[PDB]
Design a protein around this nucleic acid. Sequence first.
RNA 1: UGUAACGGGGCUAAACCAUGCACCGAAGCUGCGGCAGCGACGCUUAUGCGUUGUUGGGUAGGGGAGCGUUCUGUAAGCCUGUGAAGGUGUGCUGUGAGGCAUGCUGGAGGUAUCAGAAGUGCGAAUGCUGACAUAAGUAACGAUAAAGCGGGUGAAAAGCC
RNA 2: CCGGCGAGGGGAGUGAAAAAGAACCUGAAACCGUGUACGUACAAGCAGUGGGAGCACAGAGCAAUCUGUGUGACUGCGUAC
Lengths: 142, 110, 48, 103, 117, 150, 56
Amino acid sequence: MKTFTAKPETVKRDWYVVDATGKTLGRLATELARRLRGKHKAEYTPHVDTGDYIIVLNADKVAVTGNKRTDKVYYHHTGHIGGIKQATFEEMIARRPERVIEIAVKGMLPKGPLGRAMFRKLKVYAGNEHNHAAQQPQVLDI
Amino acid sequence: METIAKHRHARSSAQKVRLVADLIRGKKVSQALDILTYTNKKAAVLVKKVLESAIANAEHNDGADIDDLKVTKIFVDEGPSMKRIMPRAKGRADRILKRTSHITVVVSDR
Amino acid sequence: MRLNTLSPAEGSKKAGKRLGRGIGSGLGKTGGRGHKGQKSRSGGGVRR
Amino acid sequence: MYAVFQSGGKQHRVSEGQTVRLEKLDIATGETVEFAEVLMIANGEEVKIGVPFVDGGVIKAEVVAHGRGEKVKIVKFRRRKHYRKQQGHRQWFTDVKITGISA
Amino acid sequence: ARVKRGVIARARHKKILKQAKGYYGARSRVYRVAFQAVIKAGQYAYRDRRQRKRQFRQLWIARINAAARQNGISYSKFINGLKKASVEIDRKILADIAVFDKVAFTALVEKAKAALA
Amino acid sequence: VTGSGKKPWRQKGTGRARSGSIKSPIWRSGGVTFAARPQDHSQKVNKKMYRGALKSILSELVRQDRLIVVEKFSVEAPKTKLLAQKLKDMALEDVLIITGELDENLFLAARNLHKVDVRDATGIDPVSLIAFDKVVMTADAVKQVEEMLA
Amino acid sequence: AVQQNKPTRSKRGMRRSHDALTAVTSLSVDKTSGEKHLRHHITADGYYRGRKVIAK
RNA sequence: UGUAACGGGGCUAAACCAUGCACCGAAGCUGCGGCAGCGACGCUUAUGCGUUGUUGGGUAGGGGAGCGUUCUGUAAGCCUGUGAAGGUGUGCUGUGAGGCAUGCUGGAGGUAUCAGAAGUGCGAAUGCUGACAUAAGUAACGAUAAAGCGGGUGAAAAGCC
RNA sequence: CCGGCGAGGGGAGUGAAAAAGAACCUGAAACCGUGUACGUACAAGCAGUGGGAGCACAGAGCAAUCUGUGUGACUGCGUAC
Ligand SMILES: [K+]
Ligand SMILES: [K+]
Ligand SMILES: [K+]
Ligand SMILES: [K+]
Ligand SMILES: [K+]
Ligand SMILES: [K+]
Ligand SMILES: [K+]
Ligand SMILES: [K+]
Ligand SMILES: [K+]
Ligand SMILES: [K+]
Ligand SMILES: [K+]
Ligand SMILES: [K+]
Ligand SMILES: [K+]
Ligand SMILES: [K+]
Ligand SMILES: [K+]
Ligand SMILES: [K+]
Ligand SMILES: [K+]
Ligand SMILES: [K+]
Ligand SMILES: [Mg+2]
Ligand SMILES: [Mg+2]
Ligand SMILES: [Mg+2]
Ligand SMILES: [Mg+2]
Ligand SMILES: [Mg+2]
Ligand SMILES: [Mg+2]
Ligand SMILES: [Mg+2]
Ligand SMILES: [Mg+2]
Ligand SMILES: [Mg+2]
Ligand SMILES: [Mg+2]
Ligand SMILES: [Mg+2]
Ligand SMILES: [Mg+2]
Ligand SMILES: [Mg+2]
Ligand SMILES: [Mg+2]
Ligand SMILES: [Mg+2]
Ligand SMILES: [Mg+2]
Ligand SMILES: [Mg+2]
Ligand SMILES: [Mg+2]
Ligand SMILES: [Mg+2]
Ligand SMILES: [Mg+2]
Ligand SMILES: [Mg+2]
Ligand SMILES: [Mg+2]
Ligand SMILES: [Mg+2]
Ligand SMILES: [Mg+2]
Ligand SMILES: [Mg+2]
Ligand SMILES: [Mg+2]
Ligand SMILES: [Mg+2]
Ligand SMILES: [Mg+2]
Ligand SMILES: [Mg+2]
Ligand SMILES: [Mg+2]
Ligand SMILES: [Mg+2]
Ligand SMILES: [Mg+2]
Ligand SMILES: [Mg+2]
Ligand SMILES: [Mg+2]
Ligand SMILES: [Mg+2]
Ligand SMILES: [Mg+2]
Ligand SMILES: [Mg+2]
Ligand SMILES: [Mg+2]
Ligand SMILES: [Mg+2]
Ligand SMILES: [Mg+2]
Ligand SMILES: [Mg+2]
Ligand SMILES: [Mg+2]
Ligand SMILES: [Mg+2]
Ligand SMILES: [Mg+2]
Ligand SMILES: [Mg+2]
Ligand SMILES: [Mg+2]
Ligand SMILES: [Mg+2]
Ligand SMILES: [Mg+2]
């Protein structure tokens, strides 16, 4: 008898909503990445996205320890010579707060087409409101 | 069922003739003949003669009605190449390939 | 006793080595001569 | 109702009427084979877990066929070292049909 | 006794090219390239008969972990508990039960917890 | 191989593999690398081994019941039909006949029968003794063969 | 300058994906002679917009 | 050249020290099935059988045992126009070189067994000959003295008259 | 019969056979096409291999569905000789 494989056409996905207020960035991100991949389900299959949809609220209130609020640097390159750019954590929270959590989770998801697909099930919001009441998300205390 | 005409050993590379054959594959013969009339390619002359021959074959040999015919199949195959010599500079010689094509047109009322 | 029922004695007819015929034979490529040097060459070797 | 048992150094979860392919058994075709070491028997909500074997648990099966499996090619090749070897393989099996499961 | 090579040579090349069906470009058409592609495919298959056992055990372990944590215990403690309870079901079967009979899996978790207590 | 010893092209500079002879066995129309010469394939057989082989063969013929001994074997005239009838009477088809003295009538009568051979005792050979289905010998031929093999 | 590797038949086809010809969208019909003709060109019998513009 | 001196995410432990118990983890070890080399112990139709212990990564290289190809005998035999060789598919089969069967194509040869002989096996040698690709419908169409139009012929005319 | 009183072809006829039609026995491979099935326009590398969904197809089965064939989204591993 061959081992079970989940099938993308019949996987059951549920909607959750999580509050990031005061949570430690990385320790929230690991639980998010786990549940976006489906590692919490007995039907986990490495080549199938069996994960859940997660709405994240209050992204601008996420916490970090030590001196990271001012000393964590996010780098990127524009592709133009000399185009190395940077932003501190506090600058990121000020300008693009959802990006802090999105970047952390993307780094903990698989790389490749399936991991990009798993990222599309994450919905991060700066404030306390989302427009997905039609999906009836259940409160998840991560 | 279907009627065939061919022009074997036609003086043109198949790549050039296929540009024209692709215009008429699947068309009603009357529309195909119009397209060919207004295609400014030497290959259009070649293909139009084959298509006209296939239509004549269909009416004379197979008793078909021209108004019902379509170009159901058309394809171009590579014929033998004629090998020639082109003198280049400094005493060097190149081979010239004068490519030929076999043109096949199939017409049918089904 | 027919022309197609006679056999040689066991061990009397060992097959000869055939060099240079593939990996599986055990004598492919260099044919047992090793790599380079005078003794690997055609006509190579030193006198008695 | 299903049951778990060991055979051929592997474990199998089976129900009545299933056909299971096992490592070769020295039993003639058409004979009945007993698996008297059953690791677990589950019937609906009633679950008996062996520690390691269920007391009195027995699986009845009928030897349906013997055979050789699909051929597998073994290729060994050491690049640049004048070494290559190939081998073929077919593994023996015994197919059996589960006829009974008794707690 | 002169020997022409054509019939035997054709058969050998054809055997290789038949093993190369489905490969891309010259890999399914050209003897020199197809031969290298057939050899490499054989090497990978030898390697991956060994890899297959690893990858499936890894999958079973991941699924058992998920089911055990649904039932309130980690994989490592669950395995230690089964071992202390003298339960010899293997990971293939434990993963199958975790997916198909959640009640039986919960019963196994309870056995492990009782052994650990 | 017919041709000249001219180097086909200069050792270096042309970008072609080096050539030295149009007759190279690597080349189409070139020589054969180890071209054959006429050969003498005959082997030595020790006298005692030849005689021992003949004795073994004759003994096996006796054991297999393929040796038939007769007082006389002859035909009245050199006619193929007479010998055919005689062989049919003795139920013989593929047969070697050894006589003490080569009868000309018998030899002529046997020429056109391809399953049948006729020899004198001094002309026997091992391959024929094995190859024919039956071997008929006259008593005189048997005595001669005995003396020849000692 | 010259290739280091022989391009594939696939890449040859991809380059030629822009080479196909386009047929004339539609021909026009002379209002007097009824001949088809290229739009804004005279007909084979020498009409344009219903007038015999040229002989032969 | 660009973060660029944890592989990354991230981490205040997910760092370090100490103690402990779990678990993961290899082609290592064990389990199940199979093959072979060598050695013992017994049988024996004297060359195989059984039991048993143990071994089986390999370049140069040594030793052992085989597959297939053409040709000679066996063969005036055997297969073959109710379809040979060759070509092309499919199924089965052995540890491998391979073997067997059969549909289609082909249209007259092929050859068991056991022996015998070798122009007996190719991917490489900037190898040799032929065929066909690529670049590519790309560069170019050979003096920058130069053409325009009307008529003719013709299936067709910038180039012919 | 189409075509330039062409080349080339389609019929008819010969023949056991004309994909034996003279560019002629057989008619391999490279290479180039037409047709069909499946895949492919958010995706990074020796192009396979292990796992594997979906689709098409042929059988079987009362059904449930199973199997053989083709394709191969997604995924572990993986730098030719
Ligand atoms: K040596
Ligand atoms: K090809
Ligand atoms: K005679
Ligand atoms: K042993
Ligand atoms: K013969
Ligand atoms: K095979
Ligand atoms: K065949
Ligand atoms: K055949
Ligand atoms: K023979
Ligand atoms: K070469
Ligand atoms: K080109
Ligand atoms: K052009
Ligand atoms: K023919
Ligand atoms: K020929
Ligand atoms: K041909
Ligand atoms: K993007
Ligand atoms: K499939
Ligand atoms: K893959
Ligand atoms: Mg990875
Ligand atoms: Mg000059
Ligand atoms: Mg060696
Ligand atoms: Mg060397
Ligand atoms: Mg040296
Ligand atoms: Mg040396
Ligand atoms: Mg020399
Ligand atoms: Mg010959
Ligand atoms: Mg192919
Ligand atoms: Mg010669
Ligand atoms: Mg002498
Ligand atoms: Mg280079
Ligand atoms: Mg273009
Ligand atoms: Mg810098
Ligand atoms: Mg690390
Ligand atoms: Mg410790
Ligand atoms: Mg392992
Ligand atoms: Mg081991
Ligand atoms: Mg064993
Ligand atoms: Mg070892
Ligand atoms: Mg070894
Ligand atoms: Mg012979
Ligand atoms: Mg032959
Ligand atoms: Mg022959
Ligand atoms: Mg032989
Ligand atoms: Mg040779
Ligand atoms: Mg070659
Ligand atoms: Mg080599
Ligand atoms: Mg070169
Ligand atoms: Mg070229
Ligand atoms: Mg260019
Ligand atoms: Mg240009
Ligand atoms: Mg230009
Ligand atoms: Mg110039
Ligand atoms: Mg000029
Ligand atoms: Mg003019
Ligand atoms: Mg001019
Ligand atoms: Mg004609
Ligand atoms: Mg034919
Ligand atoms: Mg003939
Ligand atoms: Mg031919
Ligand atoms: Mg072909
Ligand atoms: Mg799509
Ligand atoms: Mg897409
Ligand atoms: Mg790319
Ligand atoms: Mg697979
Ligand atoms: Mg990789
Ligand atoms: Mg890697």
